[PDB]
Design a protein around this ligand. Structure first.
Ligand code: THM
Ligand code: THM
Length: 288
């Protein structure tokens, strides 16, 4: 499976932080926001990843993250000239995707919890259908909403219903079989002017192969939508990391733990960063 991080948008809520740059370049505590969703694809076992952003921000992501080789993966880049909807990732990424299965994650989504990598790996290893991930939120009318039965099978999915059928939002992480490319090419803009991911998921529902993984209350799916929520996300990460000796979404660590790079390669990554706490963390991991 390949992966895509959709990381543009004409985001304005966070002005003036985003006066120049896209939100996914902003810090969440001690690392750029984009590291979080990238870490999720990597933990899923996904090693070939396309990052899509605006004309002006795509080169900024490439300067930050590089070509992937340091992390034992492959990062590629494409431009979305206008934020015409999430489903457009699969049209921009047509050539990249080829005949393969593909996961999409949003560049501003942050997931965290015990047992999450088991779920990710399961979704990435599926050879047919789609997997979406549902999460209980306070104001579900503001999200895509997945309705399911007592056995956890999807009954419906609706984009920002005025009368939500459940309390479960459909989060910004999606795993698809290769049918997603032609599905994306066949749906039409909503009233919003957007090629809606909810429409892609409706198509998989109708095909009888939309699977939902319900993330319980022991998971965090953090809001980076406002200044207030960005700050709460930062504090959440700080708290988890301060207590343990352990980082959330440290890319070099994940590359080593996943077998993408060797202990030898991790040491070489740590060496030039030994003046800062981040390099020292990588070196400790190498030793231990
Ligand atoms: C509609 C749209 C949103 N986005 C981003 C902005 C937000 O971070 C997220 C959901 O709006 O997706 C894109 O990158 N491209 C798009 O076309
Ligand atoms: C092993 C490991 C897990 N994680 C995340 C995935 C889950 O959200 C949580 C528990 O495994 O920690 C990382 O961020 N980095 C890691 O190196």
């Amino acid at each position: 499976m390949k992966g895509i991080i959709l990381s543009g948008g004409s985001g304005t809520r966070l002005y003036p932080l985003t006066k120049v740059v896209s939100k996914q370049l902003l810090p969440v505590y001690d690392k750029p926001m984009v590291y979080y969703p990238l870490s999720v694809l990597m933990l899923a076992g996904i090693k070939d990843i396309l990052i899509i952003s605006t004309p002006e921000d795509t080169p900024r992501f490439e300067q930050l993250l590089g070509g992937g080789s340091e992390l034992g993966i492959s990062l590629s880049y494409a431009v979305q000239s206008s934020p015409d909807g999430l489903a457009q990732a699969f049209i921009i990424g047509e050539e990249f995707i080829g005949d393969d299965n593909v996961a999409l994650v949003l560049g501003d989504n942050i997931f965290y919890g015990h047992g999450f990598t088991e779920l990710l790996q399961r979704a990435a290893n599926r050879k047919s259908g789609a997997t979406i991930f549902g999460y209980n939120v306070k104001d579900p009318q503001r999200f895509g909403v997945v309705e399911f039965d007592e056995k956890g099978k999807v009954i419906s999915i609706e984009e920002k219903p005025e009368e939500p059928k459940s309390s479960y939002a459909v989060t910004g992480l999606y795993f698809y079989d290769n049918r997603v490319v032609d599905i994306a090419k066949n749906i039409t803009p909503s009233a919003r002017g957007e090629l809606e991911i909810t429409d892609v998921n409706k198509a998989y529902l109708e095909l009888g192969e939309l699977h939902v993984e319900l993330l319980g209350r022991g998971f965090a799916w953090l809001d980076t939508g406002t200044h207030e929520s960005l700050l709460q996300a930062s504090q959440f990460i700080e708290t988890i990391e301060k207590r343990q000796s352990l980082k959330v979404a440290c890319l070099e660590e994940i590359a080593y733990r996943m077998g993408y790079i060797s202990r030898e390669q991790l040491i070489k990554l740590a060496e030039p960063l030994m003046k800062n706490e981040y390099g020292q963390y990588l070196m400790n991991l190498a030793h231990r």
